[PDB]
Amino acid sequence: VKKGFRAAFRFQKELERQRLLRCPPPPVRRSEKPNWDYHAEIQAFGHRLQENFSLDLLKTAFVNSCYIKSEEAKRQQLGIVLLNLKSNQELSEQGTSFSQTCLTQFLEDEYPDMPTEGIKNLVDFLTGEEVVCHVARNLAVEQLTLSEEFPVPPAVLQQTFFAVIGALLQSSGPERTALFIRDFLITQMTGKELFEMWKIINPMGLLVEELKKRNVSAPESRLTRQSGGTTALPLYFVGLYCDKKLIAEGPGETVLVAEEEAARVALRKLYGFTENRRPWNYSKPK
Amino acid sequence: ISHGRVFRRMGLGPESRIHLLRNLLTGLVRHERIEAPWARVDEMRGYAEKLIDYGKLGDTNERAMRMADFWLTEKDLIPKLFQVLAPRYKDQTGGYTRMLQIPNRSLDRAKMAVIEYKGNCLPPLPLPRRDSHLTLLNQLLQGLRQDLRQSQEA
Amino acid sequence: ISRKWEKKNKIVYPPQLPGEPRRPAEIYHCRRQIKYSKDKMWYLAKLIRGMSIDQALAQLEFNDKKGAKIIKEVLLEAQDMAVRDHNVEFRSNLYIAESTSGRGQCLKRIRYHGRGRFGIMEKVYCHYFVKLVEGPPPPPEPPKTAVAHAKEYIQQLRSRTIVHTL
Amino acid sequence: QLSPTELTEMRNDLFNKEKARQLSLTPRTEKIEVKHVGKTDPGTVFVMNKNISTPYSCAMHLSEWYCRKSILALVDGQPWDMYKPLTKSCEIKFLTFKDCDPGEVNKAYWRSCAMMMGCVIERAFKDEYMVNLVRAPEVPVISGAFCYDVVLDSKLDEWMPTKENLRSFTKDAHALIYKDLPFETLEVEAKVALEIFQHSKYKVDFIEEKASQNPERIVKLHRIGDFIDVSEGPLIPRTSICFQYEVSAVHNLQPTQPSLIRRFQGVSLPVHLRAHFTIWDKLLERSRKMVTED
Amino acid sequence: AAPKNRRTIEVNRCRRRNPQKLIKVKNNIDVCPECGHLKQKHVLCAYCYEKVCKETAEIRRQIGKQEGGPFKAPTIETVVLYTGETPSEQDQGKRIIERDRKRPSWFTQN
Amino acid sequence: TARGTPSRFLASVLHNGLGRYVQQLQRLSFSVSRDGASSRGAREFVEREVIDFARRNPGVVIYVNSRPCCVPRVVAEYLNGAVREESIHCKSVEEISTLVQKLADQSGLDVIRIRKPFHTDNPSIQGQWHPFTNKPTTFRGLRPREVQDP
Amino acid sequence: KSGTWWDEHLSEENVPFIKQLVSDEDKAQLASKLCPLKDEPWPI
Amino acid sequence: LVIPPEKSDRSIHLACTAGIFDAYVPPEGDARISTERMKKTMASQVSIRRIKDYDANFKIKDFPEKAKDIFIEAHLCLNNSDHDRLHTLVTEHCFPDMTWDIKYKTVRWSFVESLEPSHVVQVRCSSMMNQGNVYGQITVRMHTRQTLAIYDRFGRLMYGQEDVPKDVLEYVVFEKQLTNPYGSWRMHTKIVPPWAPPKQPILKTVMIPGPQLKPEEEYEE
Ligand SMILES: [Mg+2]
Ligand SMILES: [Mg+2]
Ligand SMILES: [Zn+2]
C-alpha cells in the first residue's frame, strides 16, 4: 500500500468515467439538469435570434397539449383552478399557415417556371418533420419545449416550432417573420438538388407533358456518347432532341438510366432549378 | 517401402508376435469370444480359421496334433478342438469366426474388436442387420424385380 | 479469482408487455479447476460452438479426448438445469451460444534433468464455460456469392470522390 | 366465376376461419397425459396441452433425433400426423422409414408425394387453359410410381407433355421441396369442406364419398402453402423430407369419350432412403410405365 | 538450434486455429434402433454390447463353478438354460449351464 | 497524430451566417470557491468582468455558483448540444477573460482535424469534368474502326 | 447430410439382385459396340 | 448443521413451532355453503382463556379483521420482495414456503374482494412450557377473490393471469408467542383440504422421464 490520496482520487474519477461509458445513463431534459432558469432561458432565446418576442406569447408557444393533460393527471394523483394554461395549438396553426403561404410566395417569385405541384412539394419538404426538427433542435427549441415525453416526439417538436413562428407573427408582424422563415427554413435548400427534395417518378412522362404545354415537339432520345458497351462498367450519355435541337443530356451506366437522367436534366432546366442558377439573395431588402 | 508385406510387426519381434497371437488364440478357443485391440484380432483371425482346418484332419493325424500342441498353451483345449470345435464346423468350408469392431478402449482409446467362433452358446452379439425388405426403397426395387422377371418369361 | 459466470443466472428481467416478443431463455454454466489444458480444451469448446444441444452431445460422445467427457457432463447438467430452474419447455430446443475455456489456478513442480539441472513444470488446470440459449441453432451464414462481390465492388467504385481538390 | 388467384384466397380464408374456430373450443390450457409406448425411452409420460400439442411437441421433449427420424405417429394404434394436435390422453409411438414394418409410413409418404404433384399441376398451365383436379388414386408402393388423375382443358385434348415439359414439372416440385413447407392438417365436417371445394365438381363428389364412409361425416383436409386438398390419410410432416423427386410420365386414361382424364405420374425417395444415381435411373424407367390401381 | 525471435500471438493463432488443427465433425453417428442410444454406423452399439457382455460374464461365472478348477474344459457342447426351461431334444448330451433368471428377450433359444 | 485521431469536414451549424449570424454559445456555468486560493482569479472575474461580459452577450445565460471546490471550472454549452468543460484553476483574471471570449466565438463543433480548409456545396458552375468534356464528336457517332452501313 | 453408399439401405434380397442387374447391363452395353462399321462409322 | 456445539449454556432461541397443534379438518361440502360442535368449542374456549391470560385485552371478534390485514399485507410483500417487513408478518416456518420458490421470479398478486366474512374456526394453544414457551394458534377461514400472475426469470408469463379474479377458499393458521413480551400474531401455515379443487393448469407442457435403465436391467410393465 502506497501513501497518498491524490492518485487514488484521480483513479476513482477514471473508474467513474469508464463505468458511465459502459452503461450510458438514460437522457433527461435539460430543465431537469442543474443550472437552469426557465425565465432566463426564454429571454436568451429571443435575444440570440435578434427578435423582439412578447414573453407571454413565447411562453405559451412552448406549452403543448400533452404536457397540460399530464400535468393535470399528476395533480389528480396527488389530490391537489390554477392550471388554466393555454396550449400552443392556436399559435401553431397561425404559424403553420403563415409559413406555408410565405414559403409559397418566396418560391413562386424566385422560380416562376415551377408548376404548383413542384412548389407544393418544396414547401412540404421545408416544413416537413425532418427539416423542421433539425432546425428546432439546433435553436434550443427542444430545451424550452414543455412536453409529456422526452425525447420530444418529432410531431410535437414540429408543432412547437411553428407555434414560435406564430408568436413572432403576433409580436413583430409579417415582414419580420418572413425574414425569420428566410433565414432558418429557406436556407435548408442550400446544396439540395431539385429532385432530392421533390420526389418524382417517370420524369420522362412529366417532361413530355410539359413540352406539350409549351407547344414543343416530343423529345427524341439519341446516344451522344458511349464507352465500354460490352463490359460490366459501361458509360452512356443520352441526349434529348426537340426538332433536332439538344435540350438536355444525361449520363448513366445503362441507356435506360441515362435516358431517365437526361429527362431530369431537362426538367431542371425547364423549371429554373439548374445547379448553376443564380443563388438565393439573402441581402437586406432595399 | 512395404509393398506386399502381409504380416504386421507387433510385440518384441517375430517370435513374440507368434506368442502374442498364440495367447489370443488360446483364449478364443477356451472362451469362444474375446475382445482385444483391433489390429491384433485381425492378425490372429487368420490363424483361428486355419486351426479349425487342422482340427478337421482329426486327432490321429500326427501333424495336426503337433500343430495343436504348439498353438494351444492349455492342453485341455486340444480335446475341445478335435472333438467340439472341429465337428461343429463339419459342414462348413470356412468362415468359422466373426469379427466386429466395438467402441474404443477407455484407457488408451485403442481401436477394439470382438471375435468369436460361430455357433457358441453365449448370448448373441448385437449384429448389424440390413434394412427391412419392406422399406420404401426395397419395395420399389421388389416391384422392378417382379417386372423384369415377368418380361423375361414372356 | 473471479466467479462472474455463476452470477449471470441470477438476473431477473422485468415482465414483458403484451406486445413484446417472446424472450429466449439464457442459461450460464461452467466447471472450475479441470485437470486439463485450456489449449487442448479450446479445440473441444470450439467444436460444439453454435451447435444444437443434441448435436453437441453426439459429437462429444464419440470424441477420444479426455476433455470431451467433461464437457458432455457439463452440457447434460446445464440442459437439466434449464428445464428445471429456468422454465425451458423443451430440453432439445437449446443451442450452444457461447463455449470457451479459461486458464485455472496451476501448481508448480520440479522436473529433473541431467547434470544436476532442472525445469519447472506447471500442473495445468482450466475452466470450461458454456451458455445455452432457447431456440433452434441460428442458420449458418451462406458463403459470399459472385453477385454480392460484384455489388460491393461497384459500390466502392461509386463512393470514390475527387480527392485533394474543391 | 372467381379467378384462380381469388379462388385460393377464398379457400385459404375458409380454411383459416375453420382452424380458428376449432382452436376457440379449447377451454384455457386443459392438460392431457400421453404415455410413450415405444421400445426406446419406455415409460415416458408427456403432460401436454389438449388440441394444441402435437406428436412433434412430444418428440421435442425427447431429443432432436426423434424430431428428425419420426415421419408419422401411432396414436392409440392409429396413424397420426406429426403436426396434428392431440385431443385426448392416449398412448403414442413414433414411426420411421427404417422400421421393420414401415407400411403405414410408406403410404403417408406415398400420399404426400401425390399431393405435391397436384400442387405443381394446378399452377403450371397458362391461365388460358383450365386445370381440374380430380383425385390422387391410392396405388401400392410396389407399383413403382405415384399417380394423380387430372382433367385438362378441351383445348389441350391433343397435347402430350414433352420431355422438357416433364422436366419443368419436376423443377417446380423441387422448388416446393426447397421451400420446406409443413403439411398442415384439418379435420372438418363435410359441410365446411363442401363450401371450400364448391367450385370443383370432382372434389364435391370425392368429399361426399369420404363423408359417407365415416359416421360423423368429418373429412380430412390438408394444406401446403396456399394449396388445399382432400386426403385419404395421414401425411408426412414437411416437404423437405423428399430428396429425389421427378414427374415421370403423363398418361391418357381410357375410356376418353366422357372426359379425358390425364394420369400424371412420379416417383420419389426421402432423404433417409436416397438411392444411388444408377439405381435411381432404373426406378425412373419403371415409374414411366402406366399403373392400373386394383 | 534455438528460436531467433519470439513468435507472436498473431502468428501462433494462424497455426493453432488452422482448419487442419480443428476437430472435424463426425457424420456417421446414428441412433441404435434396439435401445435408442447413439452409435456409429460401423461400430457396435456401446449400450447393447455392454448388456450382452454382462450376461456373458454371469454365464462364464456359472461355467466356472461347474468346472471347479483349471484345465477342465469339457469335450461336449454347452447350452444355457433359464428358469422355467428344460433340455430340448437337441440339447441332450450337452453340458447344461443354468441361469437363475428369465430368458432375456434378445437371447432367443436355438 | 492524424491517423490516431478522428477527423471531420469544415462545416457550420444551420448554415450560420448565410441569412443571419447566431451566436452558438448558449450557456456558461461557473463554479467558484469563496475561500479557495485556486479560485482567486475566478472571484475577481466575477466582480468586474462577468457583469460587463453578460451585457455584451444577451443570448448567453451565465450561471455563477459559489460553492466549496478545489478546481474552479467553466462549462460551456452550445446550440448544437456540445458541452465543453474548461478548468480555470489558478488562472489570472485576464487569462479567464481570454478563455471565456474564445468560448463565446466557437461554434461548438469538435475541435479535431479538419480535412479541408474550405467547404462548398456548389464546386462547379460550368460542369464538372468528365472524360468526354474535351473530346470532339464524330459524324453518326461512329467508333474507331467501325464499318457503317454493311 | 450423412453420407451414403450404394447398398447402404438395400435389404438382403435386393443386394444380389442389384449386382446381377447392373452387371448384365454392363455386359450388354459392351456387346452392343462390337460392330462399329455397321453403325454409321466416320470416313476411313 | 443440525445441532450447534455441545455442552454450551447458550441455546437457539426459537420463535415458532413447525406444525399445527391440532389440525383443523374442515367439514366436507363447506365450499358449497358459501355434540361434537360443543366439544370442539369447549376446547377452543379453554385455549382462548390462556390466550387472554397473558394478553388481557384480546378479542376473538376483532381477530378475523386483523387476520385479513396480516394476510393481505404479507402477500403484498411478495410483489416487491419486502422481506424485512415480511418477517414481522409471518413466522419462520411460513417464510421459506412463501419466498424460496420465487427468488428469481416476479409475482404480481392482488386482493380484489372478500366474498364471505372471515370466521375463526378453531383456537388452540400449545402444551404449557414446551421449553418455557407457550404458543397460541388461531385457525381462520377465508373466502376471497384474488388475482395472481407469476412470471419467470425472463419476464415471461409462467402461471395465472394478471386481470382475472378467481375464488379462493383457504383456512390460514396464525400463531403467536404469548410468553414473549414482543410476540405478535403471524401467519403460521395453510391447511389444504383433501377435497379442495385442483389448482389451475400450468402454461407449459412437461415430460415425466421414464426409468433410466442400465444395460443389465430390463423394462417391466
Ligand atoms: Mg511396438
Ligand atoms: Mg545427481
Ligand atoms: Zn443399442
Side-chain angles (χ1 to χ4, degrees), chain E residues 83-98:
Chain E
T83 50
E85 306 179 329
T86 61
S88 178
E89 293 177 350
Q90 292 177 335
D91 298 347
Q92 294 177 335
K94 298 197 175 155
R95 172 176 65 176
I96 294 169
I97 305 295
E98 278 177 354

Side-chain angles (χ1 to χ4, degrees), chain F residues 5 26 28 44 74 86 97-99 106 120 124 129 140:
Chain F
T5 51
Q26 162 193 43
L28 273 179
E44 174 68 355
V74 60
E86 284 297 295
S97 295
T98 295
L99 160 67
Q106 281 174 342
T120 187
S124 188
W129 181 98
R140 297 175 165 169

Side-chain angles (χ1 to χ4, degrees), chain H residues 43-62:
Chain H
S44 295
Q45 294 300 320
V46 168
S47 314
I48 289 158
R49 289 155 199 157
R50 289 176 296 179
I51 283 151
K52 280 161 184 177
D53 286 348
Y54 300 87
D55 172 15
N57 302 345
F58 187 52
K59 295 198 171 193
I60 311 312
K61 303 190 165 184
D62 292 331

